[PDB]
Amino acid sequence: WGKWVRLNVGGTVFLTTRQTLCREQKSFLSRLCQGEELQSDRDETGAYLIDRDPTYFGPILNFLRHGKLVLDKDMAEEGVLEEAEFYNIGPLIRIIKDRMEE
Incomplete structure (x- = not known):
């Protein structure tokens, strides 16, 4: 193993590092690449x-x-929210929500 991690998300592979995924200790991603996810x-x-x-x-x-x-201009903020909720990143969910009242 190393510091680099590949994530096959719906058929597309993203390259990143453990340091990046584990910034949120309670997130699904940090839990994933630390082997603490049951369905790994x-x-x-x-x-x-x-x-x-x-x-x-x-x-x-x-x-x-x-x-x-x-976000790019054409990208739906609702789609990002559903993902932020799934991956369980609190700070991000809040920022997105705060951006969706005005």
Whole structure:
């Protein structure tokens, strides 16, 4: 093993590090790459399998990188929210919600 981790999210593979995923100790991702997830399934390439849409995963992963929420203009904020709720990142869910009143 190493510091690098591959996540197969709905058929698309994302490359990142343990440091990035484990910024939120109670998140699904930190729990995943620490082997504390019961359903830890991996393909032959060693990538973690996630039955979620990869379209809205980029922003989630970027928040874990630089702490900010950045969206392109055409991307639905509702889609990112559903993912943030699934991966259980509190701070991000809040920021998204706070962005959806005005």
